[PDB]
Short mmCIF file of N, CA and C in Angstrom, two decimals:
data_model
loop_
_atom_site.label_atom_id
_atom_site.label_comp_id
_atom_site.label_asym_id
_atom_site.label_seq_id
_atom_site.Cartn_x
_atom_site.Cartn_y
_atom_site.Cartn_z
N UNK X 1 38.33 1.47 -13.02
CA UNK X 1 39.24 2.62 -13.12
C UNK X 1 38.51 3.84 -13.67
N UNK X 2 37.64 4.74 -13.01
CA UNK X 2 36.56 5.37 -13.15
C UNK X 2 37.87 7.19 -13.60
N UNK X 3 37.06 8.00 -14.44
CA UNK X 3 37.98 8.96 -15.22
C UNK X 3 37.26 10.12 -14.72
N UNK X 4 36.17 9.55 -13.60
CA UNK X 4 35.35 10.64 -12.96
C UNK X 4 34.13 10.25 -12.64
N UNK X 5 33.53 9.22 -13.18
CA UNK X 5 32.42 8.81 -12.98
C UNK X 5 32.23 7.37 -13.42
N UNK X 6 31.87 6.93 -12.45
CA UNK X 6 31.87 5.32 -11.68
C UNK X 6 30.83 4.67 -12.62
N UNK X 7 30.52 3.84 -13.54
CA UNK X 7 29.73 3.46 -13.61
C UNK X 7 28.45 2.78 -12.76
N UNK X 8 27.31 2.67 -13.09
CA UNK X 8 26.12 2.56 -12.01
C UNK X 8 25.63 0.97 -11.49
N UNK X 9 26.50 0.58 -13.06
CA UNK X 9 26.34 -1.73 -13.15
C UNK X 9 27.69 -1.14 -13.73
N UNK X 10 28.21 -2.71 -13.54
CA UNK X 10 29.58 -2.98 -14.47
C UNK X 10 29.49 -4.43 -14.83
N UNK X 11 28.24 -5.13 -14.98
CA UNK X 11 27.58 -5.92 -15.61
C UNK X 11 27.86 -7.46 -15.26
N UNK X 12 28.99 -7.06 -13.81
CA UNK X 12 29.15 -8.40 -12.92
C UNK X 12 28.43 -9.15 -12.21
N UNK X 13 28.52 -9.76 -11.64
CA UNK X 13 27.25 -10.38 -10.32
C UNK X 13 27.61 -9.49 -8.83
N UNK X 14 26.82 -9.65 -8.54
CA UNK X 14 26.66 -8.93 -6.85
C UNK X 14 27.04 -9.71 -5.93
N UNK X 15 28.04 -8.64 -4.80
CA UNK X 15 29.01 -9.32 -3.80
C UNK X 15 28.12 -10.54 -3.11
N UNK X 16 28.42 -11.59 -1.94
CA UNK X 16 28.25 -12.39 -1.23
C UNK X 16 27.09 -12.11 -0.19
N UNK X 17 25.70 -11.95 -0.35
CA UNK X 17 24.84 -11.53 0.32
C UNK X 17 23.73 -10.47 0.13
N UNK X 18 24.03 -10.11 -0.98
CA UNK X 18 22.83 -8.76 -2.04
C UNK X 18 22.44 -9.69 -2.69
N UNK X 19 21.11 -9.59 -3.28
CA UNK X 19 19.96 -9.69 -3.58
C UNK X 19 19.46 -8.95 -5.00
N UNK X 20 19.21 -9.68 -6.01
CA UNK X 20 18.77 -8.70 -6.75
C UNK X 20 17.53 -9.49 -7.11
N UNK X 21 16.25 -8.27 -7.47
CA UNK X 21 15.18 -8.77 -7.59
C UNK X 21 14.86 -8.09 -8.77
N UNK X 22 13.92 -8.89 -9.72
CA UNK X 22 13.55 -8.71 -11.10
C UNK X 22 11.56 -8.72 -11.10
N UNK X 23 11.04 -7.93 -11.88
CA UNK X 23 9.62 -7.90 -11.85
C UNK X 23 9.22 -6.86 -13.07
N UNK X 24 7.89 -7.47 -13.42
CA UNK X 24 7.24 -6.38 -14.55
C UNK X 24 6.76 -4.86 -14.30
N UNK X 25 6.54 -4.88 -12.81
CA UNK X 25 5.81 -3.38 -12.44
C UNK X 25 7.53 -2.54 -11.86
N UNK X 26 7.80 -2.81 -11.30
CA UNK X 26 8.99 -2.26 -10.64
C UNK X 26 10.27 -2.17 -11.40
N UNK X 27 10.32 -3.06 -12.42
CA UNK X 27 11.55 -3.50 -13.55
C UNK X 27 12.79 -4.46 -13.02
N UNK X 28 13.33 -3.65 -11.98
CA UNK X 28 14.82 -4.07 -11.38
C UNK X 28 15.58 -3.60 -10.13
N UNK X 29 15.23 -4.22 -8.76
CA UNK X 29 16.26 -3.29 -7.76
C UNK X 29 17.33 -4.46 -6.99
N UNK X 30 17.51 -4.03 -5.91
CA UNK X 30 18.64 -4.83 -5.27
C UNK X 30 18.53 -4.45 -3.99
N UNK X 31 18.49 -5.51 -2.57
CA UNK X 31 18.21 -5.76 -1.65
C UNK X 31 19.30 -5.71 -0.68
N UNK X 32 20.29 -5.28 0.31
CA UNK X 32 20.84 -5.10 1.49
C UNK X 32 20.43 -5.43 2.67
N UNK X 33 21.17 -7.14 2.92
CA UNK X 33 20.36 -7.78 3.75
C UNK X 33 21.43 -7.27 4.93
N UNK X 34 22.32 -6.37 4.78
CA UNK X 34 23.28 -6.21 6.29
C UNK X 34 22.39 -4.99 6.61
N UNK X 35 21.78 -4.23 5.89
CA UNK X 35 20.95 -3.01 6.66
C UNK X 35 19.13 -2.88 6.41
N UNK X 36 18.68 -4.38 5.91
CA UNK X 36 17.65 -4.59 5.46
C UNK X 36 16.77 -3.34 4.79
N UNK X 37 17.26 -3.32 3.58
CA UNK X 37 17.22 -1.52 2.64
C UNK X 37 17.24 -2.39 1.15
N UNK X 38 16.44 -1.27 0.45
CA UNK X 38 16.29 -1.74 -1.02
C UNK X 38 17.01 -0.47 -1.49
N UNK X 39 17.63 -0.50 -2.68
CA UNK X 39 18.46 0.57 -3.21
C UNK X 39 17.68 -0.05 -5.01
N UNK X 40 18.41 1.14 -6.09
CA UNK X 40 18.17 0.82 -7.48
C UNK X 40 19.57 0.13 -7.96
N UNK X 41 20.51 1.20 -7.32
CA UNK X 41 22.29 1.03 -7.83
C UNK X 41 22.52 -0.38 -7.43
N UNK X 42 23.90 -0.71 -8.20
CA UNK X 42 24.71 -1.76 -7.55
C UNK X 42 25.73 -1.18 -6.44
N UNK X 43 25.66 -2.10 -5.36
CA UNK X 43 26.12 -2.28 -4.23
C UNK X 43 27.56 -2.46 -4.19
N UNK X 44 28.63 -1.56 -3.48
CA UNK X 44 30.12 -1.51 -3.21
C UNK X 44 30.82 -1.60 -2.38
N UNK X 45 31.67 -2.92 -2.16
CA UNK X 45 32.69 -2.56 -1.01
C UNK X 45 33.97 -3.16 -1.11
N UNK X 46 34.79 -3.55 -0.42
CA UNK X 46 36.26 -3.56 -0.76
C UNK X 46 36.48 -5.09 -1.09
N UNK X 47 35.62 -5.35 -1.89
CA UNK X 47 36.58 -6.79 -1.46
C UNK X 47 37.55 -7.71 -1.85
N UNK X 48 38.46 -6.82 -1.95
CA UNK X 48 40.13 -7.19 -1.68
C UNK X 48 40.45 -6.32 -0.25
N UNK X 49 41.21 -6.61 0.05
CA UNK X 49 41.97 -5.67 1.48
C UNK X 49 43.06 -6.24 2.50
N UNK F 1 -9.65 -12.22 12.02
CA UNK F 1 -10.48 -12.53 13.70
C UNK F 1 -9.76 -13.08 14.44
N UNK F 2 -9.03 -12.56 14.64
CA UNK F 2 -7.69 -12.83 15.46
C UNK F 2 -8.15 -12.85 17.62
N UNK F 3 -7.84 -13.88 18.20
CA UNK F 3 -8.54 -14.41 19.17
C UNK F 3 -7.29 -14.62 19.92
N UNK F 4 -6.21 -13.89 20.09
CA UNK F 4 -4.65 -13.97 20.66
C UNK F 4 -3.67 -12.78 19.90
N UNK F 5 -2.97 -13.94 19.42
CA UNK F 5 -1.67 -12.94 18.23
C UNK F 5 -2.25 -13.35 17.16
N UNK F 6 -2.04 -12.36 16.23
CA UNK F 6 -2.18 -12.03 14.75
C UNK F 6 -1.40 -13.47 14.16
N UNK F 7 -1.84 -13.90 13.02
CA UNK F 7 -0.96 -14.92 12.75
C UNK F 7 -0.09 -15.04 11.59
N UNK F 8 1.27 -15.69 12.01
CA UNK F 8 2.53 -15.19 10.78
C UNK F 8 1.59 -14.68 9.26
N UNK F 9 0.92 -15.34 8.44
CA UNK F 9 0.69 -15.14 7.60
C UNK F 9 -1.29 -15.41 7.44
N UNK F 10 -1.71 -14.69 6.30
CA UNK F 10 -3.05 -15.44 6.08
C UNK F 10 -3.02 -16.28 5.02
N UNK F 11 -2.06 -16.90 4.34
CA UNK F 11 -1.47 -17.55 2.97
C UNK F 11 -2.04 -16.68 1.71
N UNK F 12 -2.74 -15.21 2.19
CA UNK F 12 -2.99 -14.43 0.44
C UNK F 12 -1.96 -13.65 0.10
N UNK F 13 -2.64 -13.01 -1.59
CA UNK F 13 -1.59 -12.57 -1.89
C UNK F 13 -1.06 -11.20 -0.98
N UNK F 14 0.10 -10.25 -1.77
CA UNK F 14 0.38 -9.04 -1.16
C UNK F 14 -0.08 -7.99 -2.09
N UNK F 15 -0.56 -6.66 -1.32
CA UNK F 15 -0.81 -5.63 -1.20
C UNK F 15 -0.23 -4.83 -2.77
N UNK F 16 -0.60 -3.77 -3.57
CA UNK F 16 -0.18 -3.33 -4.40
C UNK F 16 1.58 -2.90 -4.27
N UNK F 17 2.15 -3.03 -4.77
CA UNK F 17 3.27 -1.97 -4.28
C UNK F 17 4.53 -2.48 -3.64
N UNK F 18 3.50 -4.10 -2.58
CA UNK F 18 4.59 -4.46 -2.10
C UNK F 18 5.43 -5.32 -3.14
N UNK F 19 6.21 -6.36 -2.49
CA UNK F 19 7.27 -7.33 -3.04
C UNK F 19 7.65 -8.65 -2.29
N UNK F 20 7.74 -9.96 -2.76
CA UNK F 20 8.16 -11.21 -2.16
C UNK F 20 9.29 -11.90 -2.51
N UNK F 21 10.93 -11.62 -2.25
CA UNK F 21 11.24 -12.09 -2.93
C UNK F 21 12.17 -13.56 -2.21
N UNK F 22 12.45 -15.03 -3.06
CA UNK F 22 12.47 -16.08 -2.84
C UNK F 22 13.64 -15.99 -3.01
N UNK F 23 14.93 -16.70 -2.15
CA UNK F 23 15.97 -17.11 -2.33
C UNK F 23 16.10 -18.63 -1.22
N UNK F 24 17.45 -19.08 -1.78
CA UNK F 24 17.78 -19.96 -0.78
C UNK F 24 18.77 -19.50 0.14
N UNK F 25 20.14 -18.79 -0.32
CA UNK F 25 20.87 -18.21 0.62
C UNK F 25 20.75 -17.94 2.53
N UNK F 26 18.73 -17.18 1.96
CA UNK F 26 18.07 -16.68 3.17
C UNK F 26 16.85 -17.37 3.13
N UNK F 27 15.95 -17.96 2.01
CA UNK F 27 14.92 -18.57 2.16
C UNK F 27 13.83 -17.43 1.66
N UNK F 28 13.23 -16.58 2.26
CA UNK F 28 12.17 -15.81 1.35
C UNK F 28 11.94 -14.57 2.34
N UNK F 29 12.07 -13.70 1.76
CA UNK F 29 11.50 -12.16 2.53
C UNK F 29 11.00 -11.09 1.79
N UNK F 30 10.33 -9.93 2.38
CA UNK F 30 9.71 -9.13 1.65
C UNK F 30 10.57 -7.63 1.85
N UNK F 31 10.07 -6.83 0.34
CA UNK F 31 9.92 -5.79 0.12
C UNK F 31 9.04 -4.60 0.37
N UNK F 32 9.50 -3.42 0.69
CA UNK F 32 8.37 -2.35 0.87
C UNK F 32 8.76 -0.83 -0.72
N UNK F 33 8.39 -0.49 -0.90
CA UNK F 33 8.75 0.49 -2.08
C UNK F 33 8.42 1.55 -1.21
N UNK F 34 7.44 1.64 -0.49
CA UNK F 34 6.79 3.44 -0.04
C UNK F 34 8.19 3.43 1.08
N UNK F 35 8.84 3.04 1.60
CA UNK F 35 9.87 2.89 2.75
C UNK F 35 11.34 2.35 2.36
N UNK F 36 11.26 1.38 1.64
CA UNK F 36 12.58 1.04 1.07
C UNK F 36 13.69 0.07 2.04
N UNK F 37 12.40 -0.54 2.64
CA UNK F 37 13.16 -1.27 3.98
C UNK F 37 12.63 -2.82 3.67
N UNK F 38 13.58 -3.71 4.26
CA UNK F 38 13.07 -5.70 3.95
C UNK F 38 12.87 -5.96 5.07
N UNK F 39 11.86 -6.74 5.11
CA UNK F 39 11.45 -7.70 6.61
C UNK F 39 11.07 -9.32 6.24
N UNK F 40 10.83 -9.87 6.93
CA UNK F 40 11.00 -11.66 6.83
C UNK F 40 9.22 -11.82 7.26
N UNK F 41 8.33 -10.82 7.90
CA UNK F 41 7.02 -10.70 8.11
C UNK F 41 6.00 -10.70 6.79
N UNK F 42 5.05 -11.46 7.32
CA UNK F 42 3.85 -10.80 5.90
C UNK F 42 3.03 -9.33 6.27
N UNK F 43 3.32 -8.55 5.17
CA UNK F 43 2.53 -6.72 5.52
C UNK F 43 1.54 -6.89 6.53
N UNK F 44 0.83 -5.86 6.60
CA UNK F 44 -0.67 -5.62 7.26
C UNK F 44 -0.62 -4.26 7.02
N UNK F 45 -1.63 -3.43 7.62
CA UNK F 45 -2.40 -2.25 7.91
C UNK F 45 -3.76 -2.57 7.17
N UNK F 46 -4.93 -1.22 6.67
CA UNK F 46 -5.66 -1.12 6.35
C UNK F 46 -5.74 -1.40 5.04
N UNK F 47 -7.19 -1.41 4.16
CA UNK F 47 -7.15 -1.96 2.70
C UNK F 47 -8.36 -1.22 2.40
N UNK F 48 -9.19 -0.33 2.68
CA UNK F 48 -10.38 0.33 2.27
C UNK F 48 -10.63 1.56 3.36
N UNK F 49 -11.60 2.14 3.06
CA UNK F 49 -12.15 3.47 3.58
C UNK F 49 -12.99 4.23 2.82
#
């Protein structure tokens, strides 16, 4: 329930098919295997509907 | 010395920069950082000059 600004984690696990990868040089990102893309953010979509 | 097709892998490690990461969901694929894109291939291009 964002008052303007969404947080970036909300410290849950990631939907059914993202990827998150952990390392010492890079720190922390997350993987999008439906558009094979690396992003930093956590990943969003509806899932209720 | 490739005498046909290049072959899936040479079993070394990867390249500075890149990324390998292991799941079971999908089994194991890689990362690129300069591009920001995943593939299921091991890298290539050049390594000196």
């Amino acid at each position: 329930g964002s008052s303007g600004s969404s947080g970036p984690l909300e410290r849950e696990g990631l939907p059914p098919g993202w990827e998150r990868v952990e390392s010492s040089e890079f720190g922390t990102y997350y993987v999008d295997h439906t558009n094979k893309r690396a992003q930093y953010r956590h990943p969003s979509g509806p899932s209720s509907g």
